[PDB]
DNA sequence: TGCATCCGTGAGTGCAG
DNA sequence: TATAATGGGAGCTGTCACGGATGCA
């Protein structure tokens, strides 16, 4: 069961090793923002929004 | 013509008022006709007495009143208003310290009223409030699905008026208690109520098993108020347990009859269950400083004695109809009312303890709006407030009698198992077992049995005649499913002499099981067969020959029957067709005896014996929710001497007062060369000729002229670049002229709108520089007609503002509505059906010369293929024809009661009396037998239909008695190699017409974010090519055809625009680029901090944005 | 609060209409007209000016608002894309 | 170590709407 | 801009079955 969890953890490590992702990147300083057209503000017929 | 009735059952009482569930219920909640003094604390009133009085300064409640409506039902219908009444409430504020008294009557807003037929008008659109079925307040016991010998007990109040509590006895001997999913030992609670260890054995003292197990004095080592704080700990991990706040919590959960209400029903149910009276609808009390339990120990009593063996401790069938109950409309709306009042009180005390504690009134301490919006809400977006079904008058009546197990306070679709949907032994005579929808909602939406009524507690119950000794009384009595189970109840048609039970075996049920028993043993008798079935179901003749699964489609398709201009009542009826028109409050009758003064397509005035000249005007050519002309026509002439209750005008789908959902046609039952295939129907052009299966339809077309930041919108007749042809039917203002013919493309209303920051570009300014016409600044935004629609302009409403009466939503100057009519003949694609579940689409219309016909030259109307019958097992349609044959030659209609109607001998007798008319007429007119009738008879004899060695007339007689007649193909004159079944059948046109459903699109509107085409006919949709379709193309290996559906035809904006140029230019279509919708996917993953990268084979990125996102 | 930010003082006068309209309704037994507001709102207030004040007072609505009692259509799905050609 | 027990994730299609 | 004011308020109930991760005799 120690051998087992060391796998699960090690699978996450070697995940990061082989890709070149930095664990800290699962944290955000700069939150991205999605282009405005993909989340529009529009006037429907009655000039309402 | 003459109307023969069958059936030996003398039905004691009539059908009750079939909207009573909707009218009685509401009026019983308003009481707008009871002198306030004489009102009674139920419904609207009861909510007032609940939320009041508001507590520290104290505001109290005197009385409410209702005013008549600002506008009459029609007025609201036209002007998109609500048919409502003003609600005033007289209040007195008094000061908790000085004796202050102010008293105003403050306006609360408008409550929406219920029309006579039991519906509502909400923003000018009739709607119905569907009763809701739910488990009923009470205490129940149910075996534990884990441990075979232990049983959970459950305590259930009205919804959102208390928490559910379970009393599972754990595997540690001492009993548990669940609340907000928090378990804890029960004893801690009983302590808080003042309980003593001995008065437990003093009361339990039987089950050393657990009576002695429940006791654990780690708890007993406290006074009442001690464990009271002991528990607040257990339900509030973090709140400091001050004795002013712990009493506040439990009280506000278990004794405060202000957020814990067992039903009124819930009192009586657990009352007689646990065998204890009950002060209020409340578990616990606060009386003389501490808590005095009411329910917990009685409940505690039952559960224990069950888990040993005790008598009279049964589990409960939670699906029984003594434990399920109905939230009729009045109750459902009061609930919402108790929620506005609740919010309004949160806001008064707020302004009680801030703003000025002595210079205040009822007037300014109340803001009505929280009430207003709670009502408005229940009526405009509830799941029980439904757009009314007024396709025909039955669809409206069936709606008002519907029953949903779904909704706020009930079941979510996923919540719905089997047991909720099953027919219950107790549905008998209360909820129809046929009328339910096929599909997901099966068994949740159901209908009210025809004789059934919901009592004051909200339980369905059904009538039964009392039989004493062996003789049957006329004393009828309505039983809940619970008292029903007490008796042995014999069947509706057990045979009698006078009022004594003749038979020696009687067919009865005890607790719904079928039992054979002697008449001494019999206590009650069904009232009628009609008492087990829906109203619609009761419209089905020969129901007992129809398999259940298509009686159900026969029931439902009725409500879909389109009102026909030449509509007629069925030649075979059940004896309800008249009541249904009555309660459908669509036909028009006479209020007292008198005489007819005038009569007219528009009004009917009648002089009464009371000297009154009442003038009933006629709702002529009204458009219904579903477009189906709701038209009233007059059925008396000047001078006609009219007794009371006689008819004056026929509603829609009514013919002299019988429900006319379709037309009686001459039906032939045989294959017909393919056009019968798989339920398709073949019809005679003669049906369109004499205007059978023709119906009037109207579509409203609205438009608004609004103030803009770029100018106003003008409703004009001045629309740039348009030819006088394109305007010849518009008045000077831009409205089509009432009485015109409008077809696809035609302007109904010209409208102009100002052009934006695309005021002409160079390409366009220059092009006009050539044509000596400079840029015009307004635009053709007119309202045209959509593809596949059109008709005869019947009417126009023009609402401006600046005119009287009128004021519209902000920023709109004027709105114009134009109603458009269409006469609809039957056509290839429309859907037909008969009351037996037989349905099909008209697939071909032959000219009369091709129709099969009988020897005397008459051609059949309809050819229904026989392959429809055997597997569907709906034989009743077969009887309907045979007796329809007879009636077609004796000029008769018949009334065959359900389950008590015309049997086979009785009809074969009729079929002979008709034979003489059909044939004897012949052998005397100078014509004998025919040569093709003998060739057929040769064949019929081999089949075995006729007795060999018998005269042609003898043998044709024998076939006629069989429903069968000789038939000549009109394409040849040669006979049909066999004798056929020809007869008269009642067959309706359904709401499902090709005209409403043919739609197609080359290209059109698209969707904001996805750039994929919209959906639906009204948007000019595209067709969803879903996952399962994609699979289909995938399996075929149609790569390029799939790619096309995934790019050029949906959202590859480049190659889509690129194609529609290639077609119009005659060049093959361009190979496609990336769907714009995949990009949306990328950017949406970026917005989750995920970096998706298109990569070429050597692993370097590919910019699928062609540099538009790079920097 | 508002998705469309409106100067703190316009917000202030908007609430004015609301509260005065409310008393008017509590007085009349029905909601007031535009003009019954411009009067009780005093001078410089005409019916026109109460109206265009209300339409900017107007809060937008969700493209994902539910269309039907199931949840297989969004109010946004019935909205054409006028911009792109 | 083996087994309760909780938390999270699913639950047909298209059309009308 | 100045009496004094000092810890919230509404839970929502009638599905189910599997797979995984965690707690416990």
From Swiss-Prot, chain A:
Paired cysteines (S-S): none
Membership in a protein family: Belongs to the RNA polymerase beta' chain family.
Protein task: DNA-dependent RNA polymerase catalyzes the transcription of DNA into RNA using the four ribonucleoside triphosphates as substrates.
Subunit structure: The RNAP catalytic core consists of 2 alpha, 1 beta, 1 beta' and 1 omega subunit. When a sigma factor is associated with the core the holoenzyme is formed, which can initiate transcription.
Name used for this protein in its record: DNA-directed RNA polymerase subunit beta'
Source species of the chain: Thermus thermophilus (strain ATCC 27634 / DSM 579 / HB8)
Designated gene of the protein: rpoC
Residues included from the entire protein: 487 to 535 of 1524
UniProtKB/Swiss-Prot annotation, chain B:
A GO CC term assigned to this protein in UniProt: DNA-directed RNA polymerase complex
EC number of this enzyme: 2.7.7.6
Keywords, alphabetical: DNA-directed RNA polymerase, Nucleotidyltransferase, Transcription, Transferase
Entry GO MF terms: DNA binding; DNA-directed RNA polymerase activity; ribonucleoside binding
Superkingdom of origin organism: Bacteria
Family designation: Belongs to the RNA polymerase beta chain family.
Designated name of the protein: DNA-directed RNA polymerase subunit beta
Organism of this sequence: Thermus thermophilus (strain ATCC 27634 / DSM 579 / HB8)
Curated annotation (Swiss-Prot), chain C:
Source species: Thermus thermophilus (strain ATCC BAA-163 / DSM 7039 / HB27)
Domain notes: Contains 4 domains, connected by flexible linkers. In the active conformation, the domains are in an extended conformation, each making extensive interactions with the RNA polymerase catalytic core.
Family: Belongs to the sigma-70 factor family. RpoD/SigA subfamily.
Subunit structure of this chain's protein: Interacts transiently with the RNA polymerase catalytic core formed by RpoA, RpoB, RpoC and RpoZ (2 alpha, 1 beta, 1 beta' and 1 omega subunit) to form the RNA polymerase holoenzyme that can initiate transcription.
Compartments where located: Cytoplasm
Protein name: RNA polymerase sigma factor SigA
Gene (UniProt): sigA
Full-sequence portion shown in this chain: 255 to 339 of 423
UniProt region (Sigma-70 factor domain-3), positions on chain: 12-85
Role noted for this protein: Sigma factors are initiation factors that promote the attachment of RNA polymerase to specific initiation sites and are then released. This sigma factor is the primary sigma factor during exponential growth.
Recorded superkingdom: Bacteria
